[PDB]
Amino acid sequence: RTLSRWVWISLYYVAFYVVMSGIFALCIYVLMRTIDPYTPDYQDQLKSPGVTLRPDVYGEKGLDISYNVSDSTTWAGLAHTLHRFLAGYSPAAQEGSINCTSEKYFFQESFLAPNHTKFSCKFTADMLQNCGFAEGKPCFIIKMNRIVKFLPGNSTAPRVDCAFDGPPLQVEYFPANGTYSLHYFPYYGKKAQPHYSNPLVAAKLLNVPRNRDVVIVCKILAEHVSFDNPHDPYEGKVEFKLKIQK
Amino acid sequence: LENMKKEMEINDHQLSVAELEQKYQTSATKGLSASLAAELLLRDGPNALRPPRGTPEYVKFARQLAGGLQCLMWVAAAICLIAFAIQASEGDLTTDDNLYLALALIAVVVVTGCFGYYQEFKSTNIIASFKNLVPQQATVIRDGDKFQINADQLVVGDLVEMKGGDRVPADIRILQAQGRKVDNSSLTGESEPQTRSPECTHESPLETRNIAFFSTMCLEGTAQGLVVNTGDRTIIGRIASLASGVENEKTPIAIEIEHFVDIIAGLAILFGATFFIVAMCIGYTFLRAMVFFMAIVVAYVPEGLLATVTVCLSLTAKRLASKNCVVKNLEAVETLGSTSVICSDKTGTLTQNRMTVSHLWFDNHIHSADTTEDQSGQTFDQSSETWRALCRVLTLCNRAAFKSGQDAVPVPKRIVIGDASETALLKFSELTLGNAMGYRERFPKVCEIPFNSTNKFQLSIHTLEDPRDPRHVLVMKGAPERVLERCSSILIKGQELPLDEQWREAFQTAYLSLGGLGERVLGFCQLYLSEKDYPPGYAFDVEAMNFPTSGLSFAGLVSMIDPPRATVPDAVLKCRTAGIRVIMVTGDHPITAKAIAASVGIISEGSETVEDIAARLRVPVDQVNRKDARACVINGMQLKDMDPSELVEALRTHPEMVFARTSPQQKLVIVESCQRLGAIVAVTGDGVNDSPALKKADIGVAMGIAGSDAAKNAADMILLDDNFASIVTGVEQGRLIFDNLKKSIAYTLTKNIPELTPYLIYITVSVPLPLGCITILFIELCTDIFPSVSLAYEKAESDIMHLRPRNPKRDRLVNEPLAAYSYFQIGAIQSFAGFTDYFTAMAQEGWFPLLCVGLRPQWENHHLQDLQDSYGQEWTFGQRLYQQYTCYTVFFISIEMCQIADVLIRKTRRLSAFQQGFFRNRILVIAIVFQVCIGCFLCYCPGMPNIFNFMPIRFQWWLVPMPFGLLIFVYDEIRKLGVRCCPGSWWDQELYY
């Protein structure tokens, strides 16, 4: 608390906090310089790919979607997310990408600017057969987390088997000639490949049972894939508790 | 009120014996009736002292829990439970953070409570020590018969009898006495026996012979008296109540602590609420709004700080312990370093309290002996034959003898059986002459006349050692005047000569001068009896004057003395350089008091009192303007008349003051008067008469060896060695602690900003949380502790003793300049360094800084396993969290790294690290090594990511804050360079802690 001296304070910080924001920014901007505008410096963390699903999880979903077949409003929440993802793989959207078949990895070259947008493989929603959506016995959609320059697999395709032992359910898979087709990899990155589409795998649980919580875990297997669950339950697997309480 | 107790007492010593009885309804001969005594007992109450009420420890501990910071910590702890409670009901949250964090925070408050409790200690058993004095019972005469009764049973009016070896049961009016002497050291602090008789000697009852007081004891003789006062009513009983009555008070250091707590608490509440509302406007749910708040509280309160202060004090205390200075109360460690005025007792404090010879008058010259214990002085005279003659009388004419087994100890130290005068003489000769016993052996004493009350002289006849004429030599000593009447000739040099008027006049001058010195003077003379007149057989009659007493030869005069402790004069000057005013307050007589004052330096050379001006000018005292005299000597009798306003004037008016012949209450009054001025006062004393003053003083310091038990109980600190120099050390230590405390406080506070800012950005930016709550505790509780403590070790930057005492009003432990530097300048730099590493970790992982804004809702969403980074990769919930936690860990480490520079800068307020040497402090360096070791251990050790959420950091990560750490060092170095370069103001006033 002074007087006719506050000007000696205000002006001080003005060009001291000034100098400091100026240095702080100074050091962010140098750091930023030393990173590739197409690939992060560390991939470890991300390394085991996560498996995520469309149905917004109330808790541990992907199908921890408890709803009532008898009620229209009950499913509507899950449908919004379901439509949101699928909307992306519309045919209108894909004009210019390239058509493929289930096969081996395709190498666009190095992660370099000298080539134009790397052409991604087309993916038709049509491949996901039979899947508003399933009013009863939901048809959840699975996806593998994108990771640049990662080649998951061996053989033609990386499998996804969902399992409960464990009470009855009937598993049905819709996956574009397979499971996850290898022709989709490696992923060049958003910079290199803009409207890139990752392979989806629809799963339908036609299960005869009703009114009970079924813990259904869908797992992906590969040399590359590893699982935790002692931590991230997401790591290469799903945790969904479907309940068709009708 | 105690105010009544502060005043001088009034008594019945003036009344006649018979009149005294009328008031009391008592009998001088018969004493009270059994029935009457009982009746009075119920009326008056018991002859006992009743201590006051105290407080429990449980309450004392709990009171600390409400130490601001503790309050904030409590709100945080509860708020944690509140969030937890809301959570448990609404959605089953498996997490245990809140609940646990709540547990941890509560623990922090309790542990912190212990530290403050430890600091706040008051070990006081004053009443207990007094109880130790109490005897048992007392003899009274009732129904014409004497019987022993419980002392409490004693009532006013009964007839009491005392004899040597008994403690006075109550205040008594002496009716009759025979050779009674008493020790009134309780009132005076002086042990010399004082005679007690029925006659009223003086108007002041404290001085008169006819009154005997409770708390004193009869040394010899017997006496009877009528009890005037009992219990609390007695003169000392009141002093007891007053000492008990006076409040302990609050240490200055304590006041400073509370002051900053309010400052920090204020900022905490302001930012806490300020952001609470800012969040709500943002649209944050109450569930979240509270969580942010808890973080804010943790960030703002320096959890570790109060404990650090206690540790720093304890460490300082330990050093002093090595000094032979024991500190009972941890806070007292500072007080001293804040004293403005010292009120000191003379005897046993300033002085050694050991009588001794002063000077001698022979050969028409005054010679001065060496009074000092160690005998640091020089010799006055070996050569003159006159000296040998005087020496012989001092040895021969002396009854005193050393206790056996003394040979180990030094001559002035050894215990002697005899009166003080004879012991002084014995020690005087033994030192210069060699063994006295030898002299007594060589000259056997045939006959002697011991000092008589009437005679006023002591005479001895010895066989001359000389073999040529082993005849009889007569020696005698006594009152100087009396000896003079007895002498015809004077041994001048070796030869004797007639005693002319001229020499006689010189004798008077010598006698008056020595007396002026406040010294007790004795005359010495001898006579060589004629051989023909006295045969070797010749019998001498002690009872009847068998031999001539007159026409003797006057050898010389001897006078006595005592002395200041060796360290004292130097210590006084040092206190004065420090700007501390030193006042003498003593029970002793003024002539002695003034002389020592000059010796020690209380009264500087050239300074004059009104009386001395009058003498020099040879003008009346009334004529002298008092303003002219800087120095003053006030007798207790005069003090009694004066009002406190008058006392105030004396204190303001004089720089060098001596209060002599003061009573215990008057010492208290002097102390209070100084305090009234607004000065912090220290009292130094050894005696029971010091007790009230010691209690009242802001800090009382008692002498350990010399000190009486009561004084020690009254005091805050004890000098075990009786080393007065320790006071100078004590004052320096408190100041150093204040200087070092500021450094430690600034150091601790600076880290608050890097803790605060991440929370703020979190809300405004909507970025992932840069630093967690748990992480904050790792800093304040873990890493910062050793380094903060190490600042206590710092040496003085400048000559601390050179500066004046701090102005408790003006100079505070924590001021706005500290906040500006800690919060505004350096802490800000640290915050950025923390953020930078935060950005680096995220960016390396794939989340570039641009992308982070407004991400937190998605980031926090447990449901979303697929958050997209800058690259286009998708992350699960747990995976991103690991990165986030790693961010917390690096941010944490960045604080440590930035703290390294801060520790170095905090080392010195003014001076450069080059000058001070950022290096001598071993503890400080240890702090840097341990703090880094702990941080690495926390990050690297397996299992820590679970509990603390600390993750392993890449080598590169450690480096991120390095540039910021360096900037801090340079910045502070440049700043300080400016301060020293120009003492003018700008940088100094603003930043200088």
UniProtKB/Swiss-Prot annotation, chain A:
Disulfide bonds join 100-121, 131-139, 162-218. It is a single-pass type II membrane protein. Belongs to the X(+)/potassium ATPases subunit beta family. Its main location: membrane. It comes from the Eukaryota. Glycans are attached at residues 68, 99, 115, 130, 154, 177. Residues 155-246 are annotated as: immunoglobulin-like. GO terms for molecular function: ATPase activator activity. The gene is ATP4B. The chain crosses the membrane at residues 6-26. The keyword Transcription regulation does not apply. The C-terminal lobe folds into an immunoglobulin-like domain and mediates cell adhesion properties. It comes from Sus scrofa (Pig). It is linked to Parietal cell autoantigen associated with autoimmune gastritis. The beta subunit of the gastric H(+)/K(+) ATPase pump which transports H(+) ions in exchange for K(+) ions across the apical membrane of parietal cells. Plays a structural and regulatory role in the assembly and membrane targeting of a functionally active pump. Within a transport cycle, the transfer of a H(+) ion across the membrane is coupled to ATP hydrolysis and is associated with a transient phosphorylation of the alpha subunit that shifts the pump conformation from inward-facing (E1) to outward-facing state (E2). This is Potassium-transporting ATPase subunit beta. N-glycosylation is necessary for assembly and functional expression of the pump at the plasma membrane.
Curated annotation (Swiss-Prot), chain B:
Changing residue 303 to Q: Reduces potassium-dependent ATPase activity. The keyword Phosphoprotein applies. Mg(2+) binds at residues 345, 347, 686, 690. Residues 78-100, 278-289, 762-771, 836-887, 941-955 are lumenal. Down-regulated by K(+)-competitive acid blockers (P-CABs) such as vonoprazan. One of its GO terms (biological process) is potassium ion import across plasma membrane. The keyword Transmembrane applies. The modification Phosphoserine is found at residues 421, 559, 798, 912. GO terms for molecular function: ATP binding; ATP hydrolysis activity; magnesium ion binding; P-type potassium:proton transporter activity; P-type sodium:potassium-exchanging transporter activity; potassium ion binding. Residues 184-198 have a biased composition (Polar residues). It catalyses: K(+)(out) + ATP + H2O + H(+)(in) = K(+)(in) + ADP + phosphate + 2 H(+)(out). The catalytic subunit of the gastric H(+)/K(+) ATPase pump which transports H(+) ions in exchange for K(+) ions across the apical membrane of parietal cells. Uses ATP as an energy source to pump H(+) ions to the gastric lumen while transporting K(+) ion from the lumen into the cell. Remarkably generates a million-fold proton gradient across the gastric parietal cell membrane, acidifying the gastric juice down to pH 1. The gastric H(+)/K(+) ATPase pump is composed of the catalytic alpha subunit ATP4A and the regulatory beta subunit ATP4B. Interacts (via the P-domain) with ATP4B (via N-terminus); this interaction stabilizes the lumenal-open E2 conformation state and prevents the reverse reaction of the transport cycle. This is Potassium-transporting ATPase alpha chain 1. It comes from Sus scrofa (Pig).
